[PDB]
């Protein structure tokens, strides 16, 4: 077992339920303070001890919807999860990496803020990022910098595999089969193929998915849940109970380097 582990021994049904074992509350973050634009912190209630913390970032101009599903969903298994608002002063992947870093810095600071609802809840050494589109390129950039312990690019877009090739964190890429914005063959697939051998990694292509398919809140929640929640459990919490879900008709392609070393 792991000192960080939370919640019951898992199952597929537990992962695919709308919520995990913890009740969740939320708290708004101002753009004036944050450095990253606004956001929303989701956190479990009725818990003690520190837990992993995750930034969830969007990144597509004129998006019709965003990544909000991940907030309450992931927090309810035992994480502090902050979604970033859609309309911000950030745009292409370089700026998204800065945005992510500013959001991580902000969350670290909350652990010691007397007046924060998440005071004392954050293990500042156990940080993850989930990021969509240009935010997915940003996620790969930040994964290469060596602070975060887990990365989940959603339908990532970028101009280079340079950062993917240098990822320092366990990386799970969700690809969207039918994506016309960041086509898999030009973005998610070559990014995955460039990832180092020295990290745990996975590639999950979601059958029929548009560019929005990794965002949650549509018809793909089962696959997102099984792989995404388990990714954070294994990699932020060192929780080997979740290896079983990582190592199917909704999946049109898969790659990985199981078995993952404990
Ligand atoms: Na297709």
């Amino acid at each position: 077992g792991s000192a960080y582990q939370r919640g019951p021994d898992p199952s597929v049904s537990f992962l695919e339920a709308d919520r995990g074992q913890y009740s969740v509350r939320s708290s708004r973050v101002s753009s004036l303070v944050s450095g990253f634009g606004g956001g929303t912190i989701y956190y479990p209630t009725g818990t003690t001890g520190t837990m992993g913390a995750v930034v969830v970032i969007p990144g597509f101009v004129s998006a019709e919807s965003s990544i909000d599903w991940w907030g309450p969903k992931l927090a309810s298994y035992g994480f502090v999860v902050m979604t970033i608002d859609t309309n911000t002063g950030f745009d292409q992947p370089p700026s998204r990496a800065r945005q992510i870093n500013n959001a991580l810095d902000y969350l670290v600071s909350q652990n010691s803020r007397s007046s924060s609802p998440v005071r004392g809840m954050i293990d500042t050494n156990r940080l993850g990022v989930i990021g969509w589109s240009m935010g997915g390129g940003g996620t790969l950039r930040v994964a290469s910098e060596g602070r975060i312990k887990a990365a989940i690019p959603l339908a990532p877009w970028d101009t280079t595999s340079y950062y993917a090739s240098r990822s320092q964190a366990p990386t799970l890429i969700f690809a969207c089969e039918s994506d016309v914005i960041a086509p898999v063959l030009q973005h998610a697939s070559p990014f995955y193929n460039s990832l180092p051998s020295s990290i745990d990694k996975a590639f999950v292509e979601i059958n029929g998915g548009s560019h929005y398919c990794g965002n949650g809140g549509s018809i793909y929640n089962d696959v997102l849940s099984r792989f995404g929640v388990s990714w954070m459990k294994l990699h932020l919490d060192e929780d080997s109970r979740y290896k079983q879900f990582l190592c199917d008709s909704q999946i049109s392609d898969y790659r990985g380097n199981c078995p993952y070393l404990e």
Side-chain angles (χ1 to χ4, degrees), residues 1-24 26-247 249-260 262:
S2 171
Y4 308 131
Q5 74 187 54
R6 292 177 175 278
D9 292 353
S11 72
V12 167
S13 56
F14 168 81
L15 281 162
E16 295 180 342
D18 296 349
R19 301 289 185 89
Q21 74 289 344
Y22 298 155
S23 298
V24 168
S26 66
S27 183
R28 274 299 295 174
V29 181
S30 170
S31 51
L32 208 160
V33 314
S34 78
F36 65 83
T40 310
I41 301 169
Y42 297 89
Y43 59 94
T45 64
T47 78
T48 63
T50 54
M51 69 191 67
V54 175
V55 170
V56 189
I57 187 175
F60 178 48
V61 175
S62 248
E64 296 286 349
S65 61
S66 190
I67 49 54
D68 300 82
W69 175 87
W70 285 97
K73 172 73 183 189
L74 184 62
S76 73
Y77 294 81
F79 300 93
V80 173
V81 185
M82 186 173 71
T83 62
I84 299 183
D85 288 0
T86 301
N87 305 329
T88 70
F90 299 87
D91 187 346
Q92 292 158 300
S95 75
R96 298 296 180 171
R98 290 188 294 270
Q99 192 176 17
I100 293 161
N101 280 326
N102 291 352
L104 291 167
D105 297 346
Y106 176 86
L107 278 184
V108 165
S109 293
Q110 303 311 292
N111 194 52
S112 58
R113 171 159 164 259
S114 293
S115 54
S116 170
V118 296
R119 180 198 62 78
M121 295 185 68
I122 295 160
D123 187 332
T124 64
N125 201 38
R126 303 190 298 118
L127 305 177
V129 179
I130 302 177
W132 174 45
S133 195
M134 289 176 169
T139 295
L140 290 160
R141 287 157 182 271
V142 172
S144 76
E145 298 175 359
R147 168 168 53 178
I148 68 170
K149 282 184 176 53
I152 308 181
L154 310 171
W157 187 99
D158 214 328
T159 59
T160 180
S161 290
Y162 176 97
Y163 301 93
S165 80
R166 292 165 170 72
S167 182
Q168 301 296 297
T171 301
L172 159 64
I173 293 167
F174 287 109
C176 296
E177 183 184 37
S178 300
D179 194 331
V180 302
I181 301 299
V184 173
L185 285 166
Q186 283 75 54
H187 293 274
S189 181
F191 297 162
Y192 174 83
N193 290 341
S194 80
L195 292 166
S197 64
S198 46
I199 59 162
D200 294 351
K201 56 183 170 180
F203 177 79
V204 175
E205 185 188 85
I206 294 174
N207 182 54
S210 77
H211 189 54
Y212 293 81
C213 91
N215 293 0
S218 179
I219 61 164
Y220 311 107
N221 293 343
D222 292 348
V223 64
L224 297 172
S225 295
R226 287 196 325 275
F227 282 87
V229 175
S230 296
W231 200 256
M232 297 306 196
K233 286 284 188 177
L234 182 58
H235 298 112
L236 300 186
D237 294 351
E238 304 180 347
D239 190 347
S240 292
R241 300 178 296 169
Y242 290 81
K243 283 179 185 178
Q244 61 182 301
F245 308 108
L246 299 171
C247 297
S249 69
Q250 300 185 297
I251 302 173
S252 51
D253 196 9
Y254 171 80
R255 311 168 192 151
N257 66 345
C258 294
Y260 299 147
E262 184 177 353

